[PDB]
Amino acid sequence: ANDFVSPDSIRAQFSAAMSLMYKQEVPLYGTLLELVSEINQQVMAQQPEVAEALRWTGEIERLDQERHGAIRVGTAEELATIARLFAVMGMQPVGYYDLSSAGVPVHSTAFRAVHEQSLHVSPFRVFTSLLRLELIDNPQLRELAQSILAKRQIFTSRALELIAQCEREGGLDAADAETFVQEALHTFRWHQDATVTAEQYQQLHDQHRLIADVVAFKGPHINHLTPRTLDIDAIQLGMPAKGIPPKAVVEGPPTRRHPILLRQTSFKALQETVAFRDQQGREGSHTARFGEIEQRGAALTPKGRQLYDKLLDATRVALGGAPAEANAERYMALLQANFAEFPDDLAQMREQGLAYFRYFATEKGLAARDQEGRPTTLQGLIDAGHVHFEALVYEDFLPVSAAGIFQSNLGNANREAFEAALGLQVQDELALYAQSERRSLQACAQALNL
Ligand SMILES: O=C(O)CCCC(=O)C(=O)O
Ligand code: NI
C-alpha cells in the first residue's frame, strides 16, 4: 500500500531514544539498568516456570526494553497536543486517575498501546498528569503560574508539522519517523535554565514542589523512567551497594508466587541545579530527580481489584495510617499477613475471576486437533493439557510517585473536565484486558479446530 512504518516501531524507537537521553542526564539510571539485566537473567535461569510463562505470552522478547515514563503538563492545550503526539506512536489515553484525593492538584491518564501484539513490539507507556491551577487557593500564585504557562511552547514547530502530517496522510515513512522521534525528544529533555526569576521560583516552590516542577521549566522533562524487573525483592538487595538505596516500603502487594498489579520502589537518582536569569554568577537552587523500579504482574478484574483494595486498606488501618520508612518492617509484615486472603494460585485466580488471562494451544492440543471425543469444555482442555494459560500482564499504574508527591494506589465532573482538556475520552483498561483475553480464546479455538 504505502511505505509508512508501523506506529509500534516508532514507539519502540522513541522509548529507546528517551532511555538513552535519560541515561545521559541521570547516570545512576544506567547503573540501575545493569542491575535489572543481571537480576532478570538470574530469575530466568533459576525459575523455569517464569521463563516459560514469559515465552508463552511473548513478554520474553519485550522485557529487556520495557519501560514507563512519567511527565507533567500545565495546560489543557499541552495535554491535548501531547495526546496527538503520542497517537503518532500508537499510544492512546487509557484510564483516568483523579489524584486530588491524595492531596495533589493533578489528574492524569496513561498513554500506551492497547493490543497484545502492539504491546509485544513495545509496551512503552507514559503516565501523564495535568496540573489543575484552580486548586491553587492563593490567587496571586495561581495568576503567576497561569501567566508563565501561557508563554511557553513545549513542542518544536517541526514536531507539530509531523504530527499534522501523520494525521492528514495516515502515517510516516522511516525518514519522517526518525525526524519525529528526534523532534519529540526536545519536549522531554531536561533544561537547567528556569524560565522564571529566582523569586518567582521561590514562590512557586514553597506552595508545592510539584508546582515549581511544572511551571518553572521550559517543558515537561522526564520525571522518571522506570525499567521492569522480574524480581523486585532481589533488586532491592542489590541497590544500596550501587549507591541507589531505595525506600524500604515497597508499594503494591507483598511478595507472591503469582504477582498481581505491580510492585514499586524509588530512590534518589540525581541532585540537579536550577539557574535563573536574575541571579547569575550566583548559586542557583537545587532540585532532586528520583528514580524508580517496578515489577509487573497480573492484571486484575473489577472483582480482583476490589479484593486488593480491601486487603491493602485493612493493612493501612492496622498500621495506624501512613506507611513510612520508620515503620516499614511492621508495615511489610502486616501487608503479608493481610494478603494471605488473596489466592496465590493461578487456577483459583482464574476460577474465581480475580485476574485476566491469555490462553494458548499446546503442542499436545495441536497434535490432537483432528481427534473426536476431546474434552467439551475449557477446563477439560486445560486439565488434559491441550490448553495452557498464563496471567495477562498489567499495563497500568497503582499509581505511585517516585518523588513522594501523593499517597499510593488509586484508579464525574473532574473526569469530564479531564476529557474536555484531553480532546477525547480515555479508554477503559479493564475492557481492553477482557478483549485481549477473548482474542486469545478465539485464536486457541481456531488452532485446536474447536
Ligand atoms: O508524576 C508522578 O509523580 C508519578 C506518576 C505515576 C507513576 O509514574 C507511577 O505510578 O509509577
Ligand atoms: Ni512511575
From Swiss-Prot:
Catalytic activity: 2-oxoadipate + O2 = (R)-2-hydroxyglutarate + CO2
Cofactor(s) for this UniProt protein: Fe(2+)
Biological pathway: Amino-acid degradation
Signal peptide boundaries: none
One example GO MF annotation: dioxygenase activity
Binding site for Fe(2+): H68, H224, E292
Classification via Pfam families: HGLS
Inducing factors: Up-regulated when grown on L-lysine, D-lysine or 2-aminoadipate.
Regulation: Inhibited by EDTA.
Null mutant phenotype: Deletion mutant is unable to grow on either isomer of lysine.
Site label Important for substrate specificity, positions: R72
Keywords assigned by UniProt, alphabetized: Dioxygenase, Iron, Oxidoreductase
EC number per UniProt: 1.13.11.93
Function: Catalyzes the decarboxylation and hydroxylation of 2-oxoadipate (2OA) to form D-2-hydroxyglutarate (D-2-HGA). Is specific for 2-oxoadipate. Is involved in a D-lysine catabolic pathway.
Assigned protein family: Belongs to the 2-oxoadipate dioxygenase/decarboxylase family.
Record-given protein name: 2-oxoadipate dioxygenase/decarboxylase
Species of origin: Pseudomonas putida (strain ATCC 47054 / DSM 6125 / CFBP 8728 / NCIMB 11950 / KT2440)
Gene: hglS
